[PDB]
Coordinates of C-alpha atoms in Angstrom, one line a residue:
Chain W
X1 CA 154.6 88.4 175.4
X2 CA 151.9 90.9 175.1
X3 CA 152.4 94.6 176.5
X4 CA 150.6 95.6 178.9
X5 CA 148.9 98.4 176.6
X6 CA 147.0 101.6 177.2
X7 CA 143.7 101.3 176.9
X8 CA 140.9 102.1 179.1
X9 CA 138.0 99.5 179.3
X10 CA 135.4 102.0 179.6
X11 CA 132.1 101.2 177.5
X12 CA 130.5 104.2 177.9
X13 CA 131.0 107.7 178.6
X14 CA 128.0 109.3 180.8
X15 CA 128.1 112.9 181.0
X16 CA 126.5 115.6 183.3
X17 CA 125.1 117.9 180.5
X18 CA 124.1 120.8 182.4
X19 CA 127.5 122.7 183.4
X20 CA 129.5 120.1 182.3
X21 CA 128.8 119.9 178.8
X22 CA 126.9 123.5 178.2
X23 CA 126.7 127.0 179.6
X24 CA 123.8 127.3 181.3
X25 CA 124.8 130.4 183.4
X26 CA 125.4 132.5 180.5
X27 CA 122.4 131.2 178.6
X28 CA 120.6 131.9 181.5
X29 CA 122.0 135.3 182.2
X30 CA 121.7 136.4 178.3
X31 CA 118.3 134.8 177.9
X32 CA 116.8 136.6 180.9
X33 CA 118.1 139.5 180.1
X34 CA 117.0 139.5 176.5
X35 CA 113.5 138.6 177.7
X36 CA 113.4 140.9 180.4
X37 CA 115.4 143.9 178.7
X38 CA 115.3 147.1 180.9
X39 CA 113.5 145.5 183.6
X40 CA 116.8 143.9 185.0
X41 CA 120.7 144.6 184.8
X42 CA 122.8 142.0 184.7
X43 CA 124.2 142.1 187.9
X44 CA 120.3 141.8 189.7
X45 CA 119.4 139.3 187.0
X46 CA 123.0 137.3 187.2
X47 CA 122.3 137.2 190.8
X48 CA 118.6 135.3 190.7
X49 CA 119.9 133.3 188.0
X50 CA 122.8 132.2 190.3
X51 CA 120.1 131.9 193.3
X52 CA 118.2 129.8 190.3
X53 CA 120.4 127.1 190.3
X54 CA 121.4 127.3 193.9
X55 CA 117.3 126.6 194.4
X56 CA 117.0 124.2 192.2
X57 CA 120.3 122.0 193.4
X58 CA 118.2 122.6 197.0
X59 CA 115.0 121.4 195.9
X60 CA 116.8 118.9 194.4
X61 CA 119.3 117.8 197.0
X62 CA 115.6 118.1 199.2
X63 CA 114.2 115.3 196.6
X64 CA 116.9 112.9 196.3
X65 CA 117.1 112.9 200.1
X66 CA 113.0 112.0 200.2
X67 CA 113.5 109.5 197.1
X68 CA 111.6 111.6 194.8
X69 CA 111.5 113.0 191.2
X70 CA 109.6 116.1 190.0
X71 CA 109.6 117.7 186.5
X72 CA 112.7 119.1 186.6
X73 CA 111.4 121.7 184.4
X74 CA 109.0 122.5 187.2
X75 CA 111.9 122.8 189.4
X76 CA 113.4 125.4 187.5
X77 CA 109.8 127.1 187.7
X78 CA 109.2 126.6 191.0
X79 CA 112.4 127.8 192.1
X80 CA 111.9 131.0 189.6
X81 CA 108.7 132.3 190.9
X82 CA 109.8 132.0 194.8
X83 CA 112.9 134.3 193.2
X84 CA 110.9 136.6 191.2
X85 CA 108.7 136.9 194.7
X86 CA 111.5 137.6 196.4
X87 CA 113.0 140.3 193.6
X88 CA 109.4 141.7 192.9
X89 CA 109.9 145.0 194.1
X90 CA 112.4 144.9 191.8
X91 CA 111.0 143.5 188.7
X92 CA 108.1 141.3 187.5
X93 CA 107.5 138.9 184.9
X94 CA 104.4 137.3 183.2
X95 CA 103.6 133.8 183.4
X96 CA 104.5 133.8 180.1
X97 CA 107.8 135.1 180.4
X98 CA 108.3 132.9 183.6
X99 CA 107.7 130.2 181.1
X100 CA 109.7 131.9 178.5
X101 CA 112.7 132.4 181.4
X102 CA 113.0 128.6 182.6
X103 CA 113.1 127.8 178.9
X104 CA 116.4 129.0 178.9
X105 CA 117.5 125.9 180.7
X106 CA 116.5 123.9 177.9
X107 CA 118.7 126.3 175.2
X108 CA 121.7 126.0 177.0
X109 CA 124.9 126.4 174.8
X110 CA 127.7 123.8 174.8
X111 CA 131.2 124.7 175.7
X112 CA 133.3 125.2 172.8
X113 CA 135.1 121.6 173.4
X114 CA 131.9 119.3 174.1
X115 CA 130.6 119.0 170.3
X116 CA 133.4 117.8 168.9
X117 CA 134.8 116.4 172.2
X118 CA 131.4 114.4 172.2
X119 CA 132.1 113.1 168.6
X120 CA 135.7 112.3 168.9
X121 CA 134.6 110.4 172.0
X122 CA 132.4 108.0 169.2
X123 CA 135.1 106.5 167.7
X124 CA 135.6 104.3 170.8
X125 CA 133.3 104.8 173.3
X126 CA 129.4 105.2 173.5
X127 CA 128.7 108.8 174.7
X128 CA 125.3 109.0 177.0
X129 CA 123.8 112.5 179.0
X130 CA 122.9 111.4 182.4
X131 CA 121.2 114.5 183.5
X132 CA 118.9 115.3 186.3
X133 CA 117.0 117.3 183.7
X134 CA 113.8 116.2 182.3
X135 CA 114.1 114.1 179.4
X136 CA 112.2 116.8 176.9
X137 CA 115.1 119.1 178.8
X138 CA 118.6 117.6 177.7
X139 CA 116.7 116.3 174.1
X140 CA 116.4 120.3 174.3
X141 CA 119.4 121.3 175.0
X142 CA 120.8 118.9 172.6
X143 CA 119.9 121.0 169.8
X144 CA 120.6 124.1 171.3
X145 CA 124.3 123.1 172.8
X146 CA 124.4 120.7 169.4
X147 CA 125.1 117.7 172.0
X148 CA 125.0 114.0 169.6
X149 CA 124.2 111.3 172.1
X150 CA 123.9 107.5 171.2
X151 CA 121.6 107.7 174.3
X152 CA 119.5 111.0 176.2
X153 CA 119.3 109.5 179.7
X154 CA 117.5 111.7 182.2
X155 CA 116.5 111.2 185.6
X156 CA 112.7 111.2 184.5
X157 CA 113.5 107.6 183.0
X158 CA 114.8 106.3 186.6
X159 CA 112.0 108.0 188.7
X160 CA 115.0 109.5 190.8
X161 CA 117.6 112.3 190.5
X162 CA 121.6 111.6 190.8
X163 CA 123.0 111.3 193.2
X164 CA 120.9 108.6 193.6
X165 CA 122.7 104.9 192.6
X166 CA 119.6 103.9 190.3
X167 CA 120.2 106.6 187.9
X168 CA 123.7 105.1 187.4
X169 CA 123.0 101.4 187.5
X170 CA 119.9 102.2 185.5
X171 CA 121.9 103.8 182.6
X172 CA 124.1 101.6 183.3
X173 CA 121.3 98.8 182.9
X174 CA 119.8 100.3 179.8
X175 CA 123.2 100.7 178.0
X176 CA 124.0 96.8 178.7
X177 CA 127.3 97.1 180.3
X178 CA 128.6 97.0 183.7
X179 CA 128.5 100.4 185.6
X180 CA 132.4 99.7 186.0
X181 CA 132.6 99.8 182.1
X182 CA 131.2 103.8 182.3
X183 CA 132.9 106.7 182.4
X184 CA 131.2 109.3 184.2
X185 CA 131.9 113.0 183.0
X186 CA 131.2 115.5 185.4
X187 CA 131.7 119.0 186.7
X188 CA 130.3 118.9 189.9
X189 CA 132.1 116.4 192.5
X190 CA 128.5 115.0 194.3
X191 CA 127.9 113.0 190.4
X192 CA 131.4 111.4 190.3
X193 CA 131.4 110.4 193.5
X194 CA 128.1 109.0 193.8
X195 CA 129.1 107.2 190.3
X196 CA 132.2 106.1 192.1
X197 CA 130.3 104.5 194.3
X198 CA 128.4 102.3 191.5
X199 CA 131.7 101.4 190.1
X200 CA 131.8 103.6 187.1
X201 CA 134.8 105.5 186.4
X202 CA 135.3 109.0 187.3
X203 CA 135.7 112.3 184.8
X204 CA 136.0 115.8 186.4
X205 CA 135.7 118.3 183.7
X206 CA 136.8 121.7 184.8
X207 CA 135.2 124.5 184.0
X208 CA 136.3 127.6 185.1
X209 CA 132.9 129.5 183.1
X210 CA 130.7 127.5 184.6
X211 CA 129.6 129.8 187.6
X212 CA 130.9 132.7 185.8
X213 CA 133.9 134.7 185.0
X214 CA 134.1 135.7 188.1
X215 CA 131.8 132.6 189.6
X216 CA 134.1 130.1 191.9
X217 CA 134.1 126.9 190.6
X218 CA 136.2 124.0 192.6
X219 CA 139.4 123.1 192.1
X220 CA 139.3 119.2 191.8
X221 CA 142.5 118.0 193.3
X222 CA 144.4 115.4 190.7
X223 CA 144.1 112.1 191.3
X224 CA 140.6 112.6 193.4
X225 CA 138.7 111.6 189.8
X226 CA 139.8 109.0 187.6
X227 CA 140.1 111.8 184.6
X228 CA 140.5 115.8 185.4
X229 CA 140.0 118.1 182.0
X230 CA 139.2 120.9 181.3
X231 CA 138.0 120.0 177.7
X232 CA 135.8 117.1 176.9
X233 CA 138.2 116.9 173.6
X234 CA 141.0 116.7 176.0
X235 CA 138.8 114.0 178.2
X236 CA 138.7 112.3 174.2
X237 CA 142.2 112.5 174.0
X238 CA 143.0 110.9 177.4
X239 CA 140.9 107.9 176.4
X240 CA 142.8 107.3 173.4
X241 CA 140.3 109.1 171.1
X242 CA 141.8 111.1 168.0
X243 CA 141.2 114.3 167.1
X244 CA 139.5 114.2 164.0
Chain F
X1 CA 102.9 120.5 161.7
X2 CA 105.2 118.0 163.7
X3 CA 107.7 118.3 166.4
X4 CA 109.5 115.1 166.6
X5 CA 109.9 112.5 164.4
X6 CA 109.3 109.0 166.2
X7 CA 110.6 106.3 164.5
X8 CA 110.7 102.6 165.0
X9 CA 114.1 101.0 163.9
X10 CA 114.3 97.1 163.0
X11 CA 112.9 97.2 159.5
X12 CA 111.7 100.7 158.9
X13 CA 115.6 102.3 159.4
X14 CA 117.4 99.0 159.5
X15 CA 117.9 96.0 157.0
X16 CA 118.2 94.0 159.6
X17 CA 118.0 90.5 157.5
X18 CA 120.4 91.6 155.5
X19 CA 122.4 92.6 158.9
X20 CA 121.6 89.3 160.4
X21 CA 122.1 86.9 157.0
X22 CA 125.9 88.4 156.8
X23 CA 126.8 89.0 160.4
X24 CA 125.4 84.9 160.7
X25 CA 127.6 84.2 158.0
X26 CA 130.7 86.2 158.7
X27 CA 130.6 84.4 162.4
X28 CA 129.3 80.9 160.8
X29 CA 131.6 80.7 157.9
X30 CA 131.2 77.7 155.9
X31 CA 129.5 75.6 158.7
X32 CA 125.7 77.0 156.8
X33 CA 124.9 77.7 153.8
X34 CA 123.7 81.3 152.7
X35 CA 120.2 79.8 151.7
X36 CA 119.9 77.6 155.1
X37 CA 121.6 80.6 157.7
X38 CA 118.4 82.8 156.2
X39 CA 115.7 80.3 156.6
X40 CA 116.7 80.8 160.5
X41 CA 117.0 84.5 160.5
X42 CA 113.7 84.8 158.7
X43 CA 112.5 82.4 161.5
X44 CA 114.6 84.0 163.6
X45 CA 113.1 87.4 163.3
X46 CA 109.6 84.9 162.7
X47 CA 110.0 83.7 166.5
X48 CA 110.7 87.6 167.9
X49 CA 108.0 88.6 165.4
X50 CA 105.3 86.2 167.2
X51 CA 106.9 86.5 170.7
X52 CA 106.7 90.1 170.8
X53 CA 102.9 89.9 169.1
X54 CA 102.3 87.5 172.2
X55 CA 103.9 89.7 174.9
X56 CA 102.2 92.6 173.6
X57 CA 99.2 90.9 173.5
X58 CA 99.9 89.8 177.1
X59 CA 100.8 93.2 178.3
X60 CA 104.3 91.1 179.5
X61 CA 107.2 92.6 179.1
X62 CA 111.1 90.7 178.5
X63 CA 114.5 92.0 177.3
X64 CA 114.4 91.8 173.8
X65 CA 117.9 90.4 173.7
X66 CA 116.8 87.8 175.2
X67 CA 114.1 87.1 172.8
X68 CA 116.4 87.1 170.3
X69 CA 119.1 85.2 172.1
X70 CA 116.2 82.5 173.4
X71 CA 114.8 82.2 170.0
X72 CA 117.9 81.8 168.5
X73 CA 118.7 79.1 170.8
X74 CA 115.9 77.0 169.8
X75 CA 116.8 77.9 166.4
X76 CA 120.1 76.7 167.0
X77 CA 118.6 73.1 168.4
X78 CA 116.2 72.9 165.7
X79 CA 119.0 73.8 162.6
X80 CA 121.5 71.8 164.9
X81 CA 122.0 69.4 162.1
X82 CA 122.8 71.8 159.7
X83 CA 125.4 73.6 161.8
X84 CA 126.5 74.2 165.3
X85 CA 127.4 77.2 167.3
X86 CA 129.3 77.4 170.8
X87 CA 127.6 79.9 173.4
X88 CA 129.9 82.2 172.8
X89 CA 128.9 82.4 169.2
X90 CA 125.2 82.6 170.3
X91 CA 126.0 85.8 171.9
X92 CA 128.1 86.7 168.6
X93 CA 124.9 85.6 166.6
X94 CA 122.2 87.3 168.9
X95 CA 124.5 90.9 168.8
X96 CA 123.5 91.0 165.1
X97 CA 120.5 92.4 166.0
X98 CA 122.4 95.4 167.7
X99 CA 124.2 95.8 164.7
X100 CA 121.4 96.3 162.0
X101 CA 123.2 98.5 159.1
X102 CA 120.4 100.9 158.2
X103 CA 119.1 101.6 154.8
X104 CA 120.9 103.6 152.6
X105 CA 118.3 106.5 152.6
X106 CA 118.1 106.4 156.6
X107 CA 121.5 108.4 157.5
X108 CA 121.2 111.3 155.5
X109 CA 117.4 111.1 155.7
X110 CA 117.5 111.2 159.6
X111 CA 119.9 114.0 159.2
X112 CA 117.7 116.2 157.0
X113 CA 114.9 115.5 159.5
X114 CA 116.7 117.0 162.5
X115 CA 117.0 120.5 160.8
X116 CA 113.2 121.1 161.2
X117 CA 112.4 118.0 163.7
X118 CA 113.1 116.8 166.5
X119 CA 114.0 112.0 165.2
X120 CA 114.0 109.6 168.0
X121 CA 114.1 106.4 167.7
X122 CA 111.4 104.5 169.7
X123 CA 112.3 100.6 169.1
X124 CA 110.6 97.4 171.1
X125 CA 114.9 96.3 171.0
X126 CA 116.3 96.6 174.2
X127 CA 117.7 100.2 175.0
X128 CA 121.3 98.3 174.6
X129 CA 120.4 97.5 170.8
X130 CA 118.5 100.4 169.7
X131 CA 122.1 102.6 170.8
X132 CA 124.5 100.0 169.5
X133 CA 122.4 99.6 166.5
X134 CA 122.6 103.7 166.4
X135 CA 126.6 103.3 165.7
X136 CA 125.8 100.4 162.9
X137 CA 123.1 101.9 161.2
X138 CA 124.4 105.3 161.9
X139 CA 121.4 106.7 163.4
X140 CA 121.9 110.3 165.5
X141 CA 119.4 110.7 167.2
X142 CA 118.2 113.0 169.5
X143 CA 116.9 110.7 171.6
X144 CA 116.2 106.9 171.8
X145 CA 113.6 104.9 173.4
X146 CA 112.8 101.5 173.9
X147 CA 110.1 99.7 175.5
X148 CA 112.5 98.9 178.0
X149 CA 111.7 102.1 179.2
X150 CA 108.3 101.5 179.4
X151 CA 108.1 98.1 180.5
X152 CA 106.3 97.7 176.9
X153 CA 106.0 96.8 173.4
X154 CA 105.2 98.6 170.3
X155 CA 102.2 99.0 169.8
X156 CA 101.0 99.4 173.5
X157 CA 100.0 102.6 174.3
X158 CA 102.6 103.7 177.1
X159 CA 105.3 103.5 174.4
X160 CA 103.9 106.5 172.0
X161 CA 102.2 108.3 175.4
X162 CA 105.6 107.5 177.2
X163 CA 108.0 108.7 174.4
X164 CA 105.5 111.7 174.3
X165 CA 105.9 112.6 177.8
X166 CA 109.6 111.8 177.6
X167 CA 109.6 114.0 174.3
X168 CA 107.4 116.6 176.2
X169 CA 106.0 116.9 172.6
X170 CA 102.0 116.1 172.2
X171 CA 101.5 112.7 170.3
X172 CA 99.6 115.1 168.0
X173 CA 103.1 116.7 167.4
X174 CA 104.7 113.7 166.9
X175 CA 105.2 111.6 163.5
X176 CA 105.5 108.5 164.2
X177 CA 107.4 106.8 161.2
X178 CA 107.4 102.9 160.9
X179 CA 107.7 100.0 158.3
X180 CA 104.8 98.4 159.9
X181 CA 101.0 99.4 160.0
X182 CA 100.5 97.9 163.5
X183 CA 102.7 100.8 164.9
X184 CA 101.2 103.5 163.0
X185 CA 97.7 102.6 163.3
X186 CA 98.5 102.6 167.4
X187 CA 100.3 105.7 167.2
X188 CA 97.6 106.9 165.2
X189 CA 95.7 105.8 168.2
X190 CA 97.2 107.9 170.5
X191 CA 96.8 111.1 168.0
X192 CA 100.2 110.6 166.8
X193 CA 100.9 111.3 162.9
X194 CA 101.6 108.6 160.8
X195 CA 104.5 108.1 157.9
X196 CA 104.5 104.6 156.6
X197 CA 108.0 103.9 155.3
X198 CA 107.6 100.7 152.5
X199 CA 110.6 98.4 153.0
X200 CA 110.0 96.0 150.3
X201 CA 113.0 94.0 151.3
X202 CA 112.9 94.2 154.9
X203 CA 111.5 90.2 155.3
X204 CA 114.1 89.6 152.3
X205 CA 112.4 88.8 148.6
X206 CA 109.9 86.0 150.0
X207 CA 107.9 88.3 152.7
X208 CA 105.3 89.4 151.8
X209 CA 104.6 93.1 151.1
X210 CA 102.0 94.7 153.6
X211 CA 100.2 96.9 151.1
X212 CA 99.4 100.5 152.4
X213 CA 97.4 102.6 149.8
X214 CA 97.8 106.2 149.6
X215 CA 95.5 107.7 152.5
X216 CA 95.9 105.0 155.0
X217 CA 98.3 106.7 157.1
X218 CA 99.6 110.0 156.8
X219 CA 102.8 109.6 154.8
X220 CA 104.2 107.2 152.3
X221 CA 106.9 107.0 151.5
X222 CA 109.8 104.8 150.1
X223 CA 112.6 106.4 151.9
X224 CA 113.3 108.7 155.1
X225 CA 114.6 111.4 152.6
X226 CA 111.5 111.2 150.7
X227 CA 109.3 111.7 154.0
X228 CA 112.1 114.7 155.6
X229 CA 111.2 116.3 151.7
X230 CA 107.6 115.4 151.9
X231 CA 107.6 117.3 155.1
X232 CA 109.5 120.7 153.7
X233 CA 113.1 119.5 154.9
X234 CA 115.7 121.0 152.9
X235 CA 117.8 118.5 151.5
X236 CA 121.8 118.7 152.1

């Protein structure tokens, strides 16, 4: 007879990149501040850049609910210059530093865990960035957070944002396995869930930087996501990946 | 100057007869000979060859698995006195071609590249293949495309203006690297630089060599290490 073994028949692990995998607030905070030096403190400029993603999950929580997809990248834009309008008595910035400042959501730093976490992952499992992001985005942020992906997935490929169950069955489609063979690896509840609901398995990454030192991030109950970590190499570890 | 490296895969990064001679054989076994099991992959890769040239011509595009898998099947019937092979094993056979071992410049080439370049791969195999064949032709990419995400072959313009958009990198910025001259001449095409990569042995020691001279595209080269050096990558 044959134990009943260990293993998890995942396929692939799909990960949320931005939060999950890198600090963007940080990135953001530091990069704006670099760019905009004197003009801002960090308290005025870590409050738009919280208001920054807090737009752009709007605007995009507005789009998946209309079934649409925009340039991410314009998102982040968009959702700059409405704040910038709103802190211009404050401070101003050029179009080019407007540009300059959403490109810091394209240099986003990884956690300390998620490169090698990512590549210890390889030895059993394909590791694909399902991110909202545009595609030129996360292949960004892939150098800068030094992310190694057998697959960049974005919702530009799918025409449609996650939550939305195409981007999930679409990666799931273009990876040729069963969106119950993927692990999806999240931060934020809305992705597993929705992924839950295609059949993948669930990953909650913690991570208690995300929103800040100080920034409240949600405390994922155990046993609400197939996986809770912390680390991506402690996600690795759970799925009988190796430290190398 | 360049910012990403496009690259097509079967051939140019992978030795995929090679791949698909021993991957036939290690499943086969004994049932075909060496010299018999590569008559069908050179047919085999004949019949994707001309059915890809058709769909492209036809604007039509079909999972490139199962080109491979459908062709294979009428391989199959057609060598079927020769040897045999359960449907199971036509699956086996057909995931050769996601397990193309890459040329042994192509790794530490593709690595040398990404220290001044963004190096996608943008294949006409399935984006299934093109990842698995990532892990057996250890190919890091930053990103891979296929013309499953276009609806599209190589050379049809939507794959290079597609991947450029999906890059967000002008096809000016982009060098499109390839073992074939239809690709590069496309991607020239679209303004995309071109970096012919001779694979001598890529259609085994009968294909025939398509001759490039010097000048016809914008690199030529005999390995990806020689084109990351030809364009000022430091080696490692």
């Amino acid at each position: 007879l044959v134990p009943r073994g260990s293993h998890m028949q995942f396929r692939a692990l799909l990960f949320d990149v931005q939060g999950t995998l890198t600090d963007f607030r940080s990135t953001l905070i530091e990069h704006g501040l670099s760019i905009l030096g004197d003009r801002v403190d960090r308290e005025l400029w870590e409050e738009l850049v919280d208001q920054w993603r807090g737009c752009y999950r709007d605007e995009l929580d507005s789009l998946v609910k209309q079934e649409k997809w925009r340039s991410v990248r314009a998102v982040y834009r968009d959702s700059l210059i409405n704040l910038l309008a709103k802190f211009s008595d404050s401070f101003c910035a050029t179009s080019a530093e407007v540009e300059l400042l959403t490109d810091g959501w394209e240099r986003l730093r990884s956690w300390p865990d998620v490169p090698s976490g990512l590549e210890q992952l390889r030895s059993k499992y394909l590791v694909a960035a399902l991110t909202n992001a545009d595609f030129s985005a996360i292949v960004n942020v892939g150098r800068s957070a030094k992310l190694q992906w057998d697959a960049v997935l974005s919702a530009q490929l799918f025409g449609a944002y996650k939550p939305h169950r195409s981007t999930y069955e679409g990666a799931a489609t273009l990876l040729g396995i069963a969106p119950s063979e993927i692990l999806m690896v999240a931060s934020h509840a809305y992705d597993l869930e929705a992924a839950r609901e295609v059949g993948a398995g669930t990953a909650y990454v913690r991570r208690p930087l995300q929103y800040g030192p100080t920034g409240r991030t949600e405390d994922v109950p155990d046993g609400r996501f197939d996986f809770l970590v912390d680390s991506i190499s402690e996600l690795a570890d759970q799925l009988g990946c190796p430290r190398l």
